[PDB]
Amino acid sequence: PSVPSWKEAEVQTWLQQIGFSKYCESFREQQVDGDLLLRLTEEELQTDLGMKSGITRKRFFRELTELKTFANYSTCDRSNLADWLGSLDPRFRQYTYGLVSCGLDRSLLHRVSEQQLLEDCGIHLGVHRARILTAAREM
Amino acid sequence: PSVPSWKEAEVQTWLQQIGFSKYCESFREQQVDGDLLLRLTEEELQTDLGMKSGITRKRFFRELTELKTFANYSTCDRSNLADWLGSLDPRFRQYTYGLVSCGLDRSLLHRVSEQQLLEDCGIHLGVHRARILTAAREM
Amino acid sequence: PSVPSWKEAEVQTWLQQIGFSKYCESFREQQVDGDLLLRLTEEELQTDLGMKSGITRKRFFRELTELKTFANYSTCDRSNLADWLGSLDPRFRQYTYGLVSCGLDRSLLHRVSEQQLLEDCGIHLGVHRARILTAAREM
Amino acid sequence: PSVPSWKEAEVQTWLQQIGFSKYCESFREQQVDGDLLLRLTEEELQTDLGMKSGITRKRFFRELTELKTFANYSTCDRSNLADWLGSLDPRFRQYTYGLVSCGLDRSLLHRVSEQQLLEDCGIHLGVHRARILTAAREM
Amino acid sequence: PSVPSWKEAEVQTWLQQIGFSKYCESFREQQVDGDLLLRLTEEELQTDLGMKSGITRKRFFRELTELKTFANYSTCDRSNLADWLGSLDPRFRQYTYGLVSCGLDRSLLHRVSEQQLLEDCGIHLGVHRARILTAAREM
Amino acid sequence: PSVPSWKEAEVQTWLQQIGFSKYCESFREQQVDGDLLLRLTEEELQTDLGMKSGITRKRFFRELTELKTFANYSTCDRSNLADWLGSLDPRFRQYTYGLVSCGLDRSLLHRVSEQQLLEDCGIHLGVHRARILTAAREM
Amino acid sequence: PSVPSWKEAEVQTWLQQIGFSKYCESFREQQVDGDLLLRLTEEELQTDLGMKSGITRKRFFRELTELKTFANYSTCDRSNLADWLGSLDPRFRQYTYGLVSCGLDRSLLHRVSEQQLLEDCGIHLGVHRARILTAAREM
Amino acid sequence: PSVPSWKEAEVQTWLQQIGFSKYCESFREQQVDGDLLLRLTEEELQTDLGMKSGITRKRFFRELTELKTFANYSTCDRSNLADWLGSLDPRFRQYTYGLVSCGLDRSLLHRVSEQQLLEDCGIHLGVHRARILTAAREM
What we know:
Eight copies of one chain form a homooctamer.
Chain A: H1 8-17, H2 21-30, H3 34-38, H4 42-48, H5 54-69, H6 81-88, H7 96-101, H8 114-119, H9 126-138
PDB class: hydrolase
Keywords: NAD(+) hydrolase, cell death, apoptosis, hydrolase
Assembly: octameric
């Protein structure tokens, strides 16, 4: 909760909680705060955060998805896209920060393309992208 | 059975059972649990798990397919896709975890594309993908 | 005969018979049994089995084709595709294991594409693929 | 404010303010003034300014976006595109210098293509590009 | 004559006859018999047979074409494609083994594509391929 | 003024004036006169003139654009394209030498393609190219 | 004259005549006779004949074109394509050996494609290929 | 004048005249005569003539263009394309040798394609190619 407003110290605490204390050192070197944590990628992990293991990256991204599914986005979500995504599918709430970081709100969702969701918003599952796109044009 | 809920120790036991004790060490280094075992790939095997042999990877994937064909998915399969796939073909039950990990259930199967099955769900045989796709549009 | 049920020792015996005792050592290192022998490729030979000679790979694949032409597939061929392929052409019987390993039987042959035969079933001769495809749509 | 008219010293002061004193040295080596600061890229940062961290580049670009959102463009913006972009979206004001550096004003915005916005004007978010393009053809 | 049934020793004798005694050693290392001689390629020559000279490969392929033009194919040519090709053009008789190795006979020639002749049958001259294809559809 | 007729010494004087004395040495090594200065590129700068800095290349090209905007082209501009470009936009006068070096005059401007402007004339801004092309077809 | 029947010694004599005695040694190493001389390429020259100079290759190909323009092809030209090509253009007689080596005669010239002339016959000038093709369809 | 008939010594004299005495040595090593001088390229200069400077190559090609503009082509230009090109544009006379070396005369100019002018004739400016092509179809 209030992950978007997390500073570096909260990231260290969460990394210690989820079993990534070694990479807690690495993150503290790179000054990763809540915004950068919520907008992290595979390439950034590999090049900057010392995560050279694909399996360990998968476990970390599972834990990051778990954190994004239960985060509080009241600070950044004016249109309240979090419950919209959750109503679509409870596991779709993890895309809230990716959507709002693009400037997207509930109003302009109907003009969002699949390429935009893939690239600018960071939704990588084609099955998930289709369901979000389908509901977007429905409204 | 209950492979989706396996921790690391069950993976070690299964690896010892199927003749991969050397790679049991390697898996224990990479902390592979049941979810990661069911969602394993060739690239992950090669880069992270020390399996540099294509023939040995083939034998391991045969044994993994055997395990996925007889696994219990009651924890993760709410729509019970396992018996649906088995009714399609008894050897199609191995794709249950790949399908449910995508968020797919019995309801949205008719909108699944072949590209989605190839990429997001991990079905690599084109013959198998066509039969699943054909039955999906039939219902 | 009963090549699909061959263990490693039968592979060693056959390799000794066909003049590949040096590679009999290499195969025993890689634990190649009958299923892996029938599903072998050029890339697997080169990378895993020490066969760095293209000419020697050609001779080995001639001998493998001879073995596949006279193998007994009663264990794996429920629809009895072996005599169907032989009736098409006596040299087409070598593709029986490649076809049945895909889950294909006599019923679904009419929906098989040329891309599927090339990739999933391993038929590499375009002339052979066309004749199999032509007879498939005929029935 | 008056970022477009900043010399090197103002860049050093801003870099010290935003937590980039080490890179303040690097910028002073490369003589980066306000125009070059407003027209900076990822490639220029990496090759010329010693910023080898993708995460640190992300933080720097967040701070650069914050500075561009509140800069005064009265010197270079004759048609006053800054308030036009702000009326479109308050976070769109950061593109003012990229647009005016191309010679664009309010008059010729309706002939601007998406490729032009991506390449010549430096707008990298596809979602942002679409909204600017949509409003451009509207007027 | 009876080149398709040549063993290694006949290949050594022919290589000595045509001025390739050094490469006679190399061929004896690679166990090239009549079938492999008739189905030889540029890549196989370079990688396996020590023929690193393009000019020497050209001379060897001239001599191989001369041998294929006057070989006896009674053992392998049931439909007697040799005189058919010779009637088309006396220099077309060299393609008999390439055609029959594909399983092609006089009956199925009308369904043979140019891609098939280029790849599976090994006819590399586009002018020669067109003339064979033209006569194939004529009958 | 009279930049097209500048010899090497005037280039040295201008380089000293604009803050590039180190590269004044480098230019004097490469014998860059006014014609070569007006027809300079990024690749030529990097490979021949020691300008390995992208930021420094940007500053140099700003100063080169300033010089081209106020140069006198009476020697080479028979059709007087300089005031035509200036009437289009005062910052378009920098393209005069690039246009006249191609042999272009006011008469044949209507047949000039965008590819020609990009490649032969050296106009790299797509926004600038479109405006020049639009006015070209207008007349 | 009678270049198609030249052995190695005549090639040495011609090379000495045309100023390539050093490469006369190189050719004698590679056993280049008249047929190989008339069917020589740039790649063969570079890789096998020690001609690493593009300018020297150009001079050698000028001299080879001069020799091919005045060669006697009575041995190989049954349809007498040499005077046909000469009637088309006196400098087109150099393509006689390239055409006849493909099996082409005067009869089948009308079915020859531009791709065939470029690849199988070795005519590299597009202007020359068009004129030969145009006259081919005319007859 | 009479550049097409220049031997090596005239090339040395011209190179000394135009300020390329160092490369006069290099040309004398490569035996560049008038025909090779008139048919020179960037790649040949770089690889064979030691001209590793792009700027120096540009100056040399300016001087070569000046020489080609005032050369006498009476020996090679039977149709007198030189005055035709000069009438098109006085700076188009430099393409005379490139055109006549292709076998082109005034008669077949109307069938010349832009690809042919770019590749076989060596006209590299798209603006120049279009004007030559336009006048070619006009006649």
